[PDB]
Amino acid sequence: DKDHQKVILVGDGAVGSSYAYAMVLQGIAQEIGIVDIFKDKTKGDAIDLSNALPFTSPKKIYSAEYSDAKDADLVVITAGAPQKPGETRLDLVNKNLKILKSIVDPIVDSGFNGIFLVAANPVDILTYATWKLSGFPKNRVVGSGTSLDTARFRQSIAEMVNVDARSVHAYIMGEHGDTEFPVWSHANIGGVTIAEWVKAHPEIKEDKLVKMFEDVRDAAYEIIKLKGATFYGIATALARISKAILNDENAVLPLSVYMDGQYGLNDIYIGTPAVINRNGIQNILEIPLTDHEEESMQKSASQLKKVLTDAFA
Amino acid sequence: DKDHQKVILVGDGAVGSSYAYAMVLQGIAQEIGIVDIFKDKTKGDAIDLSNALPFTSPKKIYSAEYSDAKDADLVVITAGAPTRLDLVNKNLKILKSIVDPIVDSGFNGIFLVAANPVDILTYATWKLSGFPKNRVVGSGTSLDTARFRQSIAEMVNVDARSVHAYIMGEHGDTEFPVWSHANIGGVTIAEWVKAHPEIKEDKLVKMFEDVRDAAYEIIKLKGATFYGIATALARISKAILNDENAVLPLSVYMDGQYGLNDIYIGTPAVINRNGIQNILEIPLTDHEEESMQKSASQLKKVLTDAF
Amino acid sequence: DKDHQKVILVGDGAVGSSYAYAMVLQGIAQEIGIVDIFKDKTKGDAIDLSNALPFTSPKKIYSAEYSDAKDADLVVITAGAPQKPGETRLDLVNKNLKILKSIVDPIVDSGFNGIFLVAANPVDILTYATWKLSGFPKNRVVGSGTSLDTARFRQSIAEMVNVDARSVHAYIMGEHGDTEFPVWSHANIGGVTIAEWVKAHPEIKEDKLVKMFEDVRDAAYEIIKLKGATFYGIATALARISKAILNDENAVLPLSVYMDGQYGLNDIYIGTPAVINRNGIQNILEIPLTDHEEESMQKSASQLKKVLTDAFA
Amino acid sequence: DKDHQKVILVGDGAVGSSYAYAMVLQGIAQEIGIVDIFKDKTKGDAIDLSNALPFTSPKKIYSAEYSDAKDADLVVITAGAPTRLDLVNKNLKILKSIVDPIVDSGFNGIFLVAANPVDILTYATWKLSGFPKNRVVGSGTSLDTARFRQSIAEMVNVDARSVHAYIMGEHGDTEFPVWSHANIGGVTIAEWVKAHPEIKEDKLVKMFEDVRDAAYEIIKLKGATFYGIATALARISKAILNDENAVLPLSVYMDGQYGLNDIYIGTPAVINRNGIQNILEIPLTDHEEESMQKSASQLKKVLTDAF
């Protein structure tokens, strides 16, 4: 037997670069092949990342090619073409598809038959596109979806209540983006519902809470305006998902998973808490949503479905 | 500065020793002093534990004396002698011989009590020591809760870290499961059952029953139980030493919560560098509230009688 | 693909029990099957060990049988029949062989084709016996050998010099037992030889050093006399070796490996620093020993070879 | 008690930010204050880093001011502006504006210097601050050494944690490899070559050459270098905050070692909660000793001239 976990990373941007670094520091997988149009960056990054190895568990890190995905456990897609100013949502999707096909087809042709973890934006759309171009089962194609939005939502609630975010449990669902929403109904701190927390701590105005989600929804714009880009959050979420898969944990995580009736949706990948392990998506959690929240999910899905429909035609 | 975390462990039985191992393995704290009547046992144990150190971060481990608690950050009590009121009084005397000489040493860190009966001895420790309420902690239903969650996790096949459920009240027969708030990934048990009707309501009932009798069954099989509490104790320690503000089910002092007062009982609480910071008062259903009431009542009874 | 590391543990004594617990706390492997004549102990231990899971990464822990080794990555043998008083070395070996055969044959018959990690005493002898009864390649049968003796030697040197034992590098070699010896020639603290350390810190009498090894050699007797048994050390060494294999690290570790000319030895398993990974033993390090040390190795090997010879006949 | 470790980071460039991430990921320390001229950049960075916190232990991360160093355990300096003597003087002024306001805050923990030229600025920091010699540390050849070991590891296909070799002297052109003591699993390089003659002597030569020019090559490929030093810095931090007494190659003050005096230069040293405890003086060969001598000499030259 050979216990050697190999990860292929497509896209060596700040997100990919950081993701890899997060993998190094936590000792996840024993090999990372970095694939990117800019061969020099990848080469210089593989060296810089390996410089760090003697302080953690060993790995083989190198500039790779799509064929190196032959025997990979995982393929992480991270650098979608950014939306130019004045470009339509549908055109952003279409320019990425041509690029996506150019990545998926040759990886699939290498023989690769592991799990696709998509982080490229628009993530939900490109997840479904990856599933469609790869042909892989619905549960072997995962998108980061609302994992970071959810983390940001939890850290925010944690700061307000001064509690370890790992004792805070709340989700952000729907399509990653403007049309996402908070699942306040099932949000809790140590099992104590937010509602219950508020009705015991009246100092928490319903305004602060409403603004709190608004801020998570716009978190990326704020950070980009400040430091020019965002990457630590998504890189950390990506390593978390990788760990859950590679360590076969059956952990519940907000991810973009194929819809088959849940929430009253069908044939689209959208953000929802799900059980993931070595074989990809197992159980797709379906939180009994509030009428208002179900509407928010419906609206989010619908908008995404229309774009998706127009996209493939 | 003085970035040196020190732990004093009282009681070198299977629980105490297992706890020490867990601290070594996870590299929690830099020093561990083991206090116990059997000096030879503790000496062989500190050597055996130190033998593992080159495979983890370094620590100073040794057989200790109460006087060594002078500058300890934490004192962990596991020394609990095996009528309920009798059991209590024989432990109240042993506990006094531990607490007093430790307080006389100059110790003013945090007390973590794991000796049974935990809730009672947790209270007794607080009274014997004179320390502030938030600086005497008991493991309470931490282990029951972990067992409760692992059981749900196996039933549903989901990492227990994604399962959230509590066992509350006094650690013992009267403890109860807070089903009203138990959930998986935020998805309520009640709701989980609706989506998975294969899970019979009576299977849930046995599950908690099996948790309440957990110690009995284990002791019957391997003679004793210790890996669970040892791990729980080390978890509680990482929460304090790393100032996490983590929510853990611990035995804490009641000051109104659930309509109780003047007792240490099990309930979710925020903990950090300075001990208990906030006591999470879950809104229990009528059913659960009674369970909580009765458990408190019977516990307060013994408490008063004991003193 | 399926990244699920499974470990089968034979022997649920204080060593096996602790080993498993060390695996749990560090999150190594995703499944541990505990096999032992005393089915109840194993059952009660699997429950107690699992009680700890919600505080670490998940695992499947259960009382198992030899057939459960079918698809195991690793098989850890830990509870050899103890040497009764007045029993000869050769008779200790022979009573264990009958027991060993009863373990190896049915595990091999389950289909199992991973790596054998032997900790049972006498370890070096039973390692070779395991290799002989299993037929597995020489590099897929490993004995804990002098890993703990070496660790004990390093912690000892560390305490004297007050330095982190991970910055101390020294070995104990030969057959685990009375005939082992310290490799002072290549022992160093941060690269600074012991000799060099002494010739800069004259307060270190050559007496303290001589007694220091004597104490490591007799470490087990001291601890047994005190706490009645020894287990944390070996359990920790066992988890370390497991990690090196399961994480394919190519780490150098003192282990009992087949001899093919190194040190002037042949056809016996004996303690020596070696490179191990997912496929077992790779490079067998051969420290250029001192004449005196080479003699100590020769003497250790010879004694072990004679017993081994008589054993198989 | 006060089990709260605080780090103040000065310089939010790729190195500073990467270092902060490494602290978050490994869960080292409980608070991180980031000081830098670009307040907006540091604010977006603290938010971006905090976004990762729910996946690791909790921390308080924020844009900080020198005054926040009042009760910090550690101050990490990465702010180093890009003739050698000129480079030095322009950094000596920037360094002063950092050190002075931090010392005025009341800070009396440990200074970890990572800004180039590291050894010089390490010395300058010591002089500007007035702190004890063992409480001003420089990364020195920590990264060079790591790179050196990773290179040997790839050549031989062995976990670098099982490789032991140093890069010594002033971090820069004059640094040299201490081949006489370099080893793999305790098995000397010289000895390793005898057993594996395929390893040409000139391949070893290029190896160090590639280490000396490491930064150049990386910068040429990806524009900058930071993951290595970031990881090294976080390693040095875990050694202090966890009081490990670990042996690391750092820039430390010379007081006789290698026949040098009044300078901070790279060499193996024991480090812990209180900074440098012991300076490991490796018995260098004649060849290596000269290398060490010359490196010191040229460094002492600039040092004196600069001041």
UniProtKB/Swiss-Prot annotation, chains A, C:
Biological processes per GO annotation: glycolytic process; lactate metabolic process
| Residues binding NAD(+) | V15, D36, K41, Y66, G80, A81, S102, A119, A120, N121, S144
Q: Which UniProt keywords apply?
A: Allosteric enzyme, Cytoplasm, NAD, Oxidoreductase, Phosphoprotein
The EC category is oxidoreductase
Q: Which residues form the active site?
A: H176 (proton acceptor)
How is it regulated at the activity level? Allosterically activated by fructose 1,6-bisphosphate (FBP) alone under acidic conditions, while it requires additional activation factors such as divalent cations (Mn(2+)) under neutral conditions. Under acidic conditions, Mn(2+) is an inhibitor in the absence of fructose 1,6-bisphosphate (FBP). In case of L.casei, L-LDH binds four fructose 1,6-bisphosphate (FBP) molecules per tetramer, while usual allosteric L-LDH binds only two fructose 1,6-bisphosphate (FBP) molecules per tetramer.
In which pathway does this enzyme or protein participate? Fermentation; pyruvate fermentation to lactate; (S)-lactate from pyruvate: step 1/1
Question: Could you tell me the superkingdom of the organism this chain comes from?
Answer: Bacteria
Binding annotation for substrate? Q83, R89, N121, P122, V123, D124, D149, T150, A151, R152, T230
Select a single GO molecular function from the record's annotations and give it.
L-lactate dehydrogenase activity
Q: Which residues carry this modification: Phosphotyrosine?
A: Y221
Any one GO CC term of this protein is: cytoplasm
Q: Tell me the compartments it is located in.
A: Cytoplasm
Residues binding beta-D-fructose 1,6-bisphosphate are R154, R166, S167, V168, H169
List the InterPro entries hit by this protein, alphabetically: L-lactate/malate_DH (IPR001557), L-lactate_DH (IPR011304), L-lactate_DH_AS (IPR018177), Lactate/malate_DH_C (IPR022383), Lactate/malate_DH_N (IPR001236), Lactate_DH/Glyco_Ohase_4_C (IPR015955), NAD(P)-bd_dom_sf (IPR036291)
Predominant place of localization: cytoplasm
Instruction: List the catalytic activities from the record.
Output: (S)-lactate + NAD(+) = pyruvate + NADH + H(+)
Task: List, alphabetically, the PROSITE patterns matched.
Answer: L_LDH (PS00064)
Keyword Phosphoprotein present in the record's keywords: the answer is yes
Question: Subunit notes for this chain?
Answer: Homotetramer.
User: What is this protein's function?
Assistant: Catalyzes the conversion of lactate to pyruvate.
Question: What family classification does the UniProt entry report for this protein?
Answer: Belongs to the LDH/MDH superfamily. LDH family.
Name under which the protein is recorded: L-lactate dehydrogenase
